[PDB]
Amino acid sequence: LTEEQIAEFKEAFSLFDKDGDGTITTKELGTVMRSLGQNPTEAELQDMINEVDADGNGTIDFPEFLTMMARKMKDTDSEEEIREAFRVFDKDGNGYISAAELRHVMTNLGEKLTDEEVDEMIREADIDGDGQVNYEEFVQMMTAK
C-alpha cells in the first residue's frame, strides 16, 4: 500500500472513529451515520462491525480497517483487469469467446497455434460444454495459481 492510499484510508477511518481513540464501535458508528442521516438498527450495526473485526475484540481498529479497504481495492482492481483481459479475446464483445475469435486473436498477437490447439484452449476453459468461453469460465483461467 502506498502512502497516498494509507492516507486516504486514515481519513476514511477518522470519519467513523468520532472520538479519535483508534477504535470504531457500534455506538460511534450509529452516531456518525445519524449525524449523516442513515438511521440503521443495532442489528445492521453489530454486523458491519463483525464483518471487519478480525481479532473479535468487539471494535474495529485501524489495522483491521486497512485490511478491509486493501482487500476491496484489490478485489475491484482485479475484477476490472480481468474484464479488460476478456475484451482482448472477445472481439465482437458478445460475452463469449468463440474458437474463431480465439484463433484470429492468436494471429493478431503474433502467437502460433494450430487449429486443434485452438480447440484444446477452448475446451480447457469450457466448463459448461457449449463450445464457447463466457466470462466466469474465463475468470477461472485468469485466476489459476
Binding site: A12, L36, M69
Partner: peptide, 14 residues
C-alpha cells in the same frame, strides 16, 4: 442516496 453519500456509506456497508 446520491453518489457522494453512497461513497461514504459503502466504506463500511461494502
Amino acid at each position: 442516496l446520491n453518489k457522494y453519500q453512497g461513497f461514504i456509506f459503502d466504506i463500511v456497508t461494502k
